[PDB]
Design a protein around this nucleic acid. Structure first.
Lengths: 55, 423, 196, 196, 423, 55
DNA sequence: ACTCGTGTGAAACTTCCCAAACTTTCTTTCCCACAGT
DNA sequence: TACTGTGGGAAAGAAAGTTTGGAAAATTTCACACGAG
């Protein structure tokens, strides 16, 4: 131990830390990112509904 | 309503239900370019199925809240993406499948490859997100190439699923594809099945005990085809090239993509397999007098053959409605075991991963490190998370591994970690 | 082969980090390039298991294929790069592993290292040949994967060795674009304005 | 360096056949390609000393230059061939030593093996590439050195893989001739009449 | 009288005497071809010396048995070997050295290399055997080649001994070579000395403390030359090319074999080293008006330069007359220590070995395995062969190693095995 | 020992045996071989002796 | 042509695999003036 | 004289090269004519 244990603590931290920075950009941008997905699912729904009006 | 991380509970009541929603795009591996004003359509048309005993549950739950027959209507649109053409709707009404038989690719699309994107939402504007096809390759014209396997991507290899269609005399509307209706092979102009193109031996034993081979497929070989759809198989056939409705018996070159051909039923006289202006039968093939080993053949025994692909995506709602699209959907190619026992972890390689997931071993959530898009890592939880006694793995235990998002959408995997006593 | 996983006596000691257990198995003229059902040599197990002890053995041993692939064609140099272990990457490089070797999706350890924003790996890899502009069977420059995953630091580093930022993917999207899209404005700003 | 002979701690254990004494000196990242005043790596010493123990270690180790030369440019593959030891030649071959490597007089181990009528060596060497008609800086085919030394058995063996019996020396004497001269009438009879 | 293997005794009374006979052929490394009816002579003439305070012992012992002044006359013949020209006698009368100044090589000698063989016997028909020169290379013409070191064999490298000669206006008879008479450099038409051509630094310190360099020698460099013969050295000179008795200062190419040149004495005005129609001096060199850095120069400061070689061979009679020639003579390039202590052996690499030798460590004959012509092997005899006490090598002992034939002719080596306490 | 000793006995024997076969051919041929060396030192000595007769 | 998927197949065109003088720095030959026998 | 070496040059050659043509599959793309609404 502590030979390896300090090495393993250090490795795991790297992943841990990384994963952190990732799962936190993704969450942060997602509002703004869902936004060319809404505005799109919109003026495209007004076509889903008038081809239902042709049956 | 703020997002609810799935719970130890919600889960155990999915390993009982298994009430999966699931998309499932079928589609051709290649698509012919369309120079200038013209419009070559995707000649098997990209076919958006929609399996899973839980699309129903989503119609049920929805209406039981105050929802139209119009509202709980899944509403899909396809598109090559990156265009001013906009998208094209699919009629998912009535039947659950659908096909987009007027899709093409301009001369003003420089990209030497491309992808089909299947946008979707419920009528209520309630979103369900974009689905993606498994990579498609532009070509300029079916490439008639002798034995240099240089491009390789174009050569139909053994084992691959392929769909073959019949169109006649050069008219757009006739198009009919070898499909299976319940167990009886026909030629729909709506439905196309995908068959595996397994290779066989030149010298033959009985018509069963089917033992397969390696390498690419060359004209003249013997090839059985099993449908993934009905499971059924056609008798042992022999693929041969075709030039002006004549089936040259001595074609020694390898089957390239989008090539015309014909299927000699082995040991049935000079009979072949042929398109019926109805339900599918066999045909004798005309004389062969001036040209010796070159048989003349029917309009209907002349098929076009293309290698295909599927793009599956399962996903359950484990915490009811979620505001944002359930997409991109995690798919998991491989599961690697890093390390051992008390340090044991697991690496997951797949694609479309996202930091906001967490791999669950059965009902126990395990800490999840996200390395990137196509790799993830998690800590094999202690055996005493399942069998509460034991400090050690005293004998084999197998739980199913699965990805779970934040707002508890749960993407299934059919992969299973198996604890094992130390060797 | 315990036939459960297809793993050998060596494979095991590699994963379990028994550093001299491995040694006797090597005194025995036991082949160190056996494949388990994943298609991995004990070295792959050793790297995977951050087992510096055993690792060091196998790499110091001449018989051992350092560039062995897996069923998905992953080289130890690949895991090394993604699994973020200390030293290994370098020691394999020094022992003359094919630095440009690729997996089935044709991604180099430089690629992966840029996918996992593994700046250290990327730098060592750059200073040891490494096609900085290599593409994968999606025509993806490793500067790309970076700009996709948005791993900015690794990205600054290729922009640093002047990776070509104009090489696109196999759909004619610049890396510059998959940034824009995935909402990494930083990686954008960098691609817009750093070097040239 | 004991500076008497220029020899290292490794060199010694090689010559003295201390097979595990060598092992720890390798646990120590001690360089195993150091040159003594003769210009030989411990491997050379190991071969010279028929020390299978130590030998095996060094060759199983990847760092070790298998094709290292001496001040006269002798490879271990050369000693191996002349010093008539068992196995070693083969083991070095299998570990992928340059079989056609030469010393300063430009003689290959095949050459030497024909000089010392070392039939075994010559066969193994032939079945592993080995230019059978190589020359040295006297234009001497190894068939020649055989025919000089009159070592007949090795000679039959190259005549056996059809070495070119007509390639001369750098003075236009056939091997056939240096036989005649040195009074080996057997080697003559064989060159006059065996194969063609 | 049947042949007597040398004895423990004969030996110890040679390590006191050391009354060695020794041949010693000097000669150039190249020889110009001689096309058709012509006859180009070897322009430093191969020069068969005959050192060793023991040739006298052989005149003494011989006559003291009933032998003429005519009988104890060493009687030598040289030859290129392989010819119908037969051989040419040498006049070893009076003085002990000799030179063969009419040796050539026909157009009808296809061999692109060759060797000088110096046959010898005492007047009484009593044989002494053939001696061989150290490999010589035919050329077609002195090759004036710019900086491509492709042949390399032709380029005069640093450190090599070279002899340089002066011939004038194009007449055969004038030929005079830089030789040393006792300590005063002259130009004999009988004697030629061999000087080492050491390289030096462009920028200079004092005229001593001579520190050498690597690589080949190029015109323009500074080069001191030390004679092996007297030990003496000429002041620091600068070698420059020559075309039509003009010494081009800016010659950046490497000195090829048999090239005309001149030696600028460093820092002496414009003085050079020049041939004296007498005893050797220096010369100012003419003007240089139309050609700027190209000085015009004398007949006598224009030397031809050729790289040389020696072929030594020592051998003592340790059991008196022997019927067969004392030849081939074993020469021992290197002495390797295989193994250690109680197993300790010794590998000997040289040339001309023969199964009928046996390497002696001082006075103790050691068992000798003959591997081949150029390799031998013998067993390091126990230390208690010299110091009769001790089972171990308690502290450093050094005996001289030497090769000894069957009929006890003994070929010396000046190489020494040194016992050492184990580390 | 006997592991190595039997191996070393076997090696040494090789050299030994070899050396033997060599030093035994050389001795055997040497008569016949000295013979183009006598006959040569002869009709060449009748030239060493008549250039002594020119002094 | 009335306007729009399909297939002809002819005309432009791409890397590509391989066979030629010479870029070309080396020789080897032989043919012939100049000075001494 | 007319034959001895010698230097020396000039025409005869030659094996390590760069590369220029260009002859041999397989792209692009475009211009076009059946058969159908």
């Amino acid at each position: 131990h502590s030979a390896v244990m300090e090495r393993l603590r250090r490795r795991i931290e790297l992943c841990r830390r990384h994963h952190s920075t990732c799962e936190a950009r993704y969450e942060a941008v997602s509002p703004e990112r869902l936004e060319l997905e809404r505005q799109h699912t919109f003026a495209l729904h007004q076509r889903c509904i008038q081809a239902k009006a042709k049956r | 309503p703020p997002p609810k991380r799935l719970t130890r509970e919600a889960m155990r009541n999915y390993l009982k239900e298994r009430g999966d929603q699931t998309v499932l795009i079928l589609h051709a591996k290649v698509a012919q370019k369309s120079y200038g004003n013209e419009k070559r359509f995707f000649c098997p048309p990209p076919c958006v199925y929609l399996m899973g005993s839980g699309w129903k549950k989503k119609k049920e739950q929805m209406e039981r809240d105050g929802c139209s027959e119009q509202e709980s209507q899944p509403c899909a649109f396809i598109g090559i993406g990156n265009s001013d053409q906009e998208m094209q709707q699919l009629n998912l009404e009535g039947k659950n499948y659908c096909t987009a038989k007027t899709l093409y690719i301009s001369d003003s699309d420089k990209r030497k490859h491309f992808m089909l994107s299947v946008k979707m939402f419920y009528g209520n504007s309630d979103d369900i997100g974009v689905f993606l096809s498994k990579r498609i390759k532009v070509i300029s014209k079916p490439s008639k190439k002798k034995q240099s396997l240089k491009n390789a991507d174009l050569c139909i290899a053994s084992g691959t699923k392929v769909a073959l269609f019949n169109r006649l005399r050069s008219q757009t509307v006739s198009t009919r594809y070898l499909h299976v209706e319940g167990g009886n092979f026909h030629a729909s102009s709506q439905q196309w099945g995908a068959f595996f193109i397994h290779l066989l031996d030149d010298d033959e034993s009985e018509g069963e005990e089917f033992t397969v081979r390696d390498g690419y497929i060359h004209y003249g070989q013997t090839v059985k085809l099993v449908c993934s759809v009905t499971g059924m198989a056609l008798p042992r056939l022999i693929i041969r090239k075709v030039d002006k409705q004549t089936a040259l018996l001595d074609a020694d070159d390898p089957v390239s993509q989008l090539h015309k051909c014909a299927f000699y039923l082995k040991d049935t006289e000079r009979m072949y397999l042929c398109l019926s202006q109805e339900r599918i039968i066999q045909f004798q093939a005309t004389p062969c007098p001036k040209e010796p080993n070159k048989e003349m053949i029917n309009d209907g025994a002349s098929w076009t053959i293309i290698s295909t692909d599927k793009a599956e995506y399962t996903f359950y709602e484990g915490m009811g409605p979620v505001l944002a699209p359930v997409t991109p959907v995690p798919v998991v190619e491989s599961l690697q075991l890093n390390g051992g026992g008390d340090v044991a972890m697991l690496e997951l390689t797949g694609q479309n991963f996202t930091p906001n997931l967490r791999v669950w071993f059965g009902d126990v959530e395990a800490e999840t490190m996200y390395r990137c898009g196509e790799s993830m890592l998690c800590v094999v939880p202690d055996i005493s998370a399942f069998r509460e006694g034991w400090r050690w793995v005293r004998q084999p235990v197998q739980v199913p591994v699965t990805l779970v998002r934040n707002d508890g959408i749960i993407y299934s995997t059919s992969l299973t970690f198996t604890y094992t006593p130390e060797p | 082969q315990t036939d459960r996983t297809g793993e050998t006596a060596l494979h095991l000691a590699a994963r379990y980090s028994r550093s001299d257990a491995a040694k006797r198995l090597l005194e025995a003229s036991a082949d160190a390039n056996i494949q388990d059902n994943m298609g991995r040599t004990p070295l792959h197990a050793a790297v995977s298991a951050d087992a510096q002890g055993v690792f060091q053995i196998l790499i110091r041993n001449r018989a051992t294929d350092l560039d062995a692939r897996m069923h998905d064609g992953t080289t130890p140099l690949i895991l090394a790069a993604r699994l973020a272990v200390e030293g290994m990457l370098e020691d394999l490089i020094n022992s003359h592993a094919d630095v440009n070797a690729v997996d089935d999706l044709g991604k180099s350890a430089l690629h992966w290292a840029a996918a996992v924003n593994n700046v250290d790996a990327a730098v060592v890899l750059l200073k040891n040949g490494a096609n900085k502009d290599m593409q994968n069977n999606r025509e993806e420059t490793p500067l790309f994967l970076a700009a996709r995953e948005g791993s900015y630091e690794t990205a600054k580093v290729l922009l640093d060795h002047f990776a070509n930022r104009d090489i696109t993917d196999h759909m004619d999207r610049l890396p510059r674009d998959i940034a824009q899209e995935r909402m990494h404005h930083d990686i954008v700003r960098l691609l817009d304005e750093y070097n040239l």
